[PDB]
Amino acid sequence: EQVCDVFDIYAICACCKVESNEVFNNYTFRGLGNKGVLPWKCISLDMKYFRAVTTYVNESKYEKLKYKRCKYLNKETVDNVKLQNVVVMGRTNWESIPKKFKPLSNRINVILSRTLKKEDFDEDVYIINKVEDLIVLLGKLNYYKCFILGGSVVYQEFLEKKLIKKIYFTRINSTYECDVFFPEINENEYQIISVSDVYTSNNTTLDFIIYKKTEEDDFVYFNFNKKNSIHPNDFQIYNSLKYKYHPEYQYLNIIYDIMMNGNKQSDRTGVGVLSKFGYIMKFDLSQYFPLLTTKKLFLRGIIEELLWFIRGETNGNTLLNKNVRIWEANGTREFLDNRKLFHREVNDLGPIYGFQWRHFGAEYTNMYDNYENKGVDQLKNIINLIKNDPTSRRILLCAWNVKDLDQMALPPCHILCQFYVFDGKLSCIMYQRSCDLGLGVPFNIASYSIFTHMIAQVCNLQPAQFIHVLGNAHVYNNHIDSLKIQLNRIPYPFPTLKLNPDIKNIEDFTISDFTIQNYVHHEKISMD
Template sequence: MLQFFSGLLRSSFLFRPPKCLTLPHQLHLKRLKTRLKIQLSLSDDYPHSIMDYQTENKENIYCNIHTCEKEYLNAIDYIIKHGSRRSNRTGTDTLSVFGMQMRYNIREAFPLFTTKRVFWRGILEEMLWFIRGSTNSNELKDKNVHIWDANGSRSFLDNLGFFEREEGDLGPVYGFQWRHFGAEYTDFKSEYGKTGVDQLHNVIDLIKNNPNDRRIIMSAWNPMDLPKMALPPCHVMCQFYVNNGELSCQMYQRSADMGLGVPFNVASYSLLTYMIAHITDLKPGDFIHTLGDAHVYVNHIEPLKIQLQRALHPLPTLKINRKVTDIDDFKINDFEIINYKPHGKIQMDMAV
């Protein structure tokens, strides 16, 4: 494919448009030539161009099962080399690129990255917490999972003006939107029953009964509720796709912390895909991760350079230990990660 485009660029047709073409057509060809030049120049350094996927060999369209992590590492390397330095609400600058996409083959391996140890139990507990519709960060804290502690702290809530809100009450964040979209949020102790739209239930129902539907979507982005949230959703929405007995998921993430957040997010939505595939009698297919503002915090650059030097290990597999038919019936002991042999932990501080 690269040779095709290279030949096309060298052709006299692109460099010297025929005189019979009108000016608008000539301008269009000039723009096409520029775009192709940019695409070709990026293809050597940036592995996420369409050229990586447009191939006649289907096995090469998807990353090798045990080297999918390389896509993530390549993205980090590209951001460090080419990202724009930007300020943000946290006070810690980032190097940022807008618009990236990575595809993970989750058919036979699970994308729990190996170049540093990823907190699997935290991923699992958080996903079950989302599914319960909970917005109480204390529930995770009590299980020794502290990923939401800072956003639910008294000082953080007070800084946002939530003086009357109890510590740990995050507002109508992910789980509430997944299970009660549109309902009126009061606090984390209230019972919401069947109020609002249960998007997760609707997704599963569509996968079972109308698998070709192009509207199998779940969104955490509710503009009416954003002012009530301790943190607006970073992973905004996901769409599911059924084909040849496989379930794939694409997630759009508006803000992607490549060092800390993205390894968590990749495993989290891959886990959700496994869970939904299990209860709908499908097999997991692909997880496609689409990023808006993909960034590396400047205080993560050196730790990430260490990670980039580490050798890839084979990815683990995920086993679901018993037959579950209802998404609400999953328990933490239902899941087993097999042959996870990562490198050691790399310390990176979270920007709040």
């Protein structure tokens, strides 16, 4: 029997990044305080979380805890003759709390001090001289759970003395000056078991993770009727998590589903795939920018491609001269000839995305022609519908021009975008007919999330949801080993995207107008 298990002693903390290709690990989030106070001004949502966790009590479960504690102390009663949690603090910590919040409401307040005396305190608020006097006080109290609230000294000694059953760890994804830090967590001592959704509060993203020390028959009946070379230990870390609420799991769960249940199919490359048909993912752009964190991703190229689209260009050389090689293989002489485009100049990609967005229906000649005022300017049309008729159900942008497919270097994977406006907020669905989960889809989420921001800003709206509909969704067999590595990495809180606020027209964006902030990521993975 362990003391922390008998007396249910937990730690709860909130750590930021600290002012120093930077490498990342859990120890990236370690900033606790600065000059006796919190490193940040105010992060309300963590405050609300901290209070919610340290005040919550379950009466109907206390008798099992009381029974266990008395058995361990060779007693029949807590006596030895309104349930609340206990919260333990350091003196410096208790001094940093403003007066009007002390003692903490609905909690048994305990202060570890070597200089304070209980006479100038109340009797509700206890003072104890060392760690051992806590265990004595807990054995004499009725309480639900015991939360170590810090600070840095208290965390360290409790952690080395193995008195912590779980750590409730808030990751504050921003950087502050700090002089005190959470002690490094030994991953052979604790491991992450649950990760929350990602949130925005007071101009920072944050999430919540949990470290752990290392009728109903009718349901069965309805399951009376309930594959690929993938082994248990392959996804040990992935399957060991209990709560996977981070939105990155929307992408990772789809990969897991394809690996476990996908259909074996052949492809042009001869690599072969596992495929499934029909998925949705939803990302809340008001709370985070969903740039994958379980590997490193770069954004300059996909931003340039998007600016290239908006200009309505079809000339692959424009990208190539900026060393954006997304379309290079699709514009070679051999690739075009295999498309039977024998009279197409190298890197002339034909009436692809940008041409369809600005000139749908115009006759394509070559990438140097002047198409001004030719065909339908869809992009201008949708921006005008969003501004002037926001409840239209016809706000769609379509790249799948059936008449021009064979003239394109290849037909679009991103068939269409539809927009939706409510209470000054813009959402976007993108339908993708063909989804390379390992390589393409991480970039695709970023492209159309950025696009949704761009459209929202030029329409004086706030982005809300990017909604990604996947058609033929596949994992190439040569990515399977790399994706096994990636599925067993635990996501970090997402970054944020900042657009130059001065840009008010869709055509005025330049590469320098986009900034990714606070991107914390695992190391790059060559998909192979």
